[PDB]
Each structure stands twice: as structure tokens, then as C-alpha cells.
Amino acid sequence: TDCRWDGCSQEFDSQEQLVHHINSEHIHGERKEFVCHWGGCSRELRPFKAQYMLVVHMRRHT
């Protein structure tokens, strides 16, 4: 019944609430994770909170 989506502190009473939460916030909600999938990147797939930060980060690989 508790959310373990990295960055999420949400705890619930029931499976049905967790299911609705994950669908609402983490699947269909505003995208808040922007991962660099560059092979050997020292971030190790740790997400940025905004696309702009990923764009700036890509200058390090190019």
C-alpha cells in the first residue's frame, strides 16, 4: 500500500489507493524524471527534475 517510486513519500491504506496513485502521478502525471541513458554516465540513470537540466547535462557527453 506504500509508494517506493524514487522521490515519492506517499503511504496509503489500500492497494486500490496505491494503484490509482501510481497511474495518476507516476504513469500519466506531469513528467518529473528526465534520465540520461548515455553509456557510462557517472549519474548512473539518476533522473533530473526538468528536461532543460538534461539538455544542459548532454553538453558533457558531446
Can you tell me whether residue 11 is helix, strand or coil?
Answer: strand
Binding site for a second copy (CB under 8 A): 4-7, 15, 18-19, 22-23, 26-27, 33, 35, 37-40, 45, 47, 51, 54-55, 58, 61-62
The amino acid sitting at 55 is V
Picked from Zn ion, a second copy, none, the partner binding residue 10 (CB below 5 to 8 A depending on kind) is Zn ion
Please tell me whether residue 3 binds Zn ion under the rule CB under 5 A: yes
Residue 12: name the closest of 3, 22, 25 by CA.
3
Residue 36: name the closest of 48, 24, 28, 50 by CA.
48
Picked from a second copy, Zn ion, none, the partner binding residue 48 (CB below 5 to 8 A depending on kind) is none
